[PDB]
Design a binder for these strands. Structure first.
Ligand SMILES: [Cl-]
Ligand SMILES: [Mg+2]
Ligand SMILES: [Mg+2]
Ligand code: NA
Length: 326
DNA sequence: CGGCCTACG
DNA sequence: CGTAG
DNA sequence: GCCG
């Protein structure tokens, strides 16, 4: 009744198993901090299955036959059903390793490998990192300076104001170019921790060279607190009553021939896209990325004019963005 | 057992 | 190494 | 950690 890949089922943003999924996601996150990508994937997939169920799990019986529920994930759910807490989850939550790796990897410019090295060196707090700035890249310095603002979610209201400023710069850089909101906000989130925009132009080729022209214009408007092509990972100044705050914004350019693939990829969720690419390759023998869908036997790229085309190519029922919250 | 998404900066 | 979803 |  429940298919094995997340791209085969609808997953809404809000659901009926929030506490269970959150606990499994703690274990997934902790597996990532230890470099166990396989365990991370299993716990993420198990959490996602619960998000896709039509009602709450109330009894252990109800996990029988669900994909990605084995001894370990079932025990976690069992303990939550019986006691309201899972001892393993709570031990992770309180652990110095989990808490420090979570804090450090939240910094823009710091991944698991850097966080782990700092942890092994004995560093534990952001102020520890600030006291050794020669150990930091320019990107990490910006991430550390702006960390407090970047830790506070932005609202859809904020997103709409940002989009107008990006559109103004894009229109000067290339008249006729368009700006599409992607990421979690396109999946229906009312808040989120960064904003993603996808930029194209209806005449194939006209988008070449566009992103530098857009960045220069936003920089000259004083809106860019940090930037480093077709992807730009920025920190922008967002107005606030009587002041402003830093916000992470990603800007991506695609040619219109690739736009449906880029839209699909950048709309996420992350798990949904990994699952969709896995399904494409393993079940259909086709290779998917944010630029296209390749048949390696015929050595040809599928043309798509819409996300609907891509789901059809892959033999999957169409899911709107709001149902891609795997 | 092998596999676990696939890119760009 | 970082970033993205 | 789980699936095929
Ligand atoms: Cl693993
Ligand atoms: Mg996002
Ligand atoms: Mg983003
Ligand atoms: Na980070």
């Amino acid at each position: 009744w429940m298919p094995a890949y997340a791209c085969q089922r609808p997953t809404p943003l809000t659901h009926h198993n929030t506490g269970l999924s959150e606990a499994l996601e703690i274990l997934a996150e902790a597996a990532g901090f230890e470099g166990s990508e396989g365990r991370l994937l299993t716990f993420c997939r198990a959490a996602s299955v619960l998000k896709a169920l039509p009602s709450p799990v109330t009894t252990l019986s109800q996990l029988q036959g669900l994909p990605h529920f084995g001894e370990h994930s079932s025990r976690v759910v069992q303990e939550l059903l019986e006691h309201g807490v899972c001892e393993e989850v709570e031990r992770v939550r309180r652990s110095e390793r989990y808490q420090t790796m979570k804090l450090f990897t939240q910094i823009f410019g710091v991944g698991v490998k850097t966080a782990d090295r700092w942890y092994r060196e004995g560093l534990r707090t952001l102020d520890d990192l600030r006291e050794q700035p020669q150990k930091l890249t320019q990107q990490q310095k910006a991430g550390l300076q702006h960390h407090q603002d970047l830790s506070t979610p932005v609202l859809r209201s904020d997103v709409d104001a940002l989009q107008q400023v990006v559109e103004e710069a894009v229109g000067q850089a290339l008249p006729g170019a368009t700006v599409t909101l992607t990421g979690g906000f396109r999946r229906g989130k009312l808040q989120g921790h960064d904003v993603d925009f996808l930029i194209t132009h209806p005449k194939e080729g006209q988008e070449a060279g566009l992103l530098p022209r857009v960045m220069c214009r936003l920089q000259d408007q004083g809106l860019i607190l940090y930037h480093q092509f077709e992807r730009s990972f920025c920190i922008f100044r967002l107005p606030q009553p009587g002041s402003w705050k830093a916000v992470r914004v990603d800007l991506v350019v695609a040619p219109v021939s690739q736009f449906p693939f880029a839209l699909l990829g950048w709309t996420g969720s992350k798990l949904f896209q990994r699952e969709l690419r896995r399904f494409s390759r393993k079940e259909k023998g086709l290779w998917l990325n944010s630029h296209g869908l390749f048949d390696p036997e015929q050595k040809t790229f599928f043309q798509a004019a819409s996300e609907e085309d891509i789901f059809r190519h892959l033999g999957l029922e169409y899911l709107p963005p709001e149902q891609r919250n795997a």
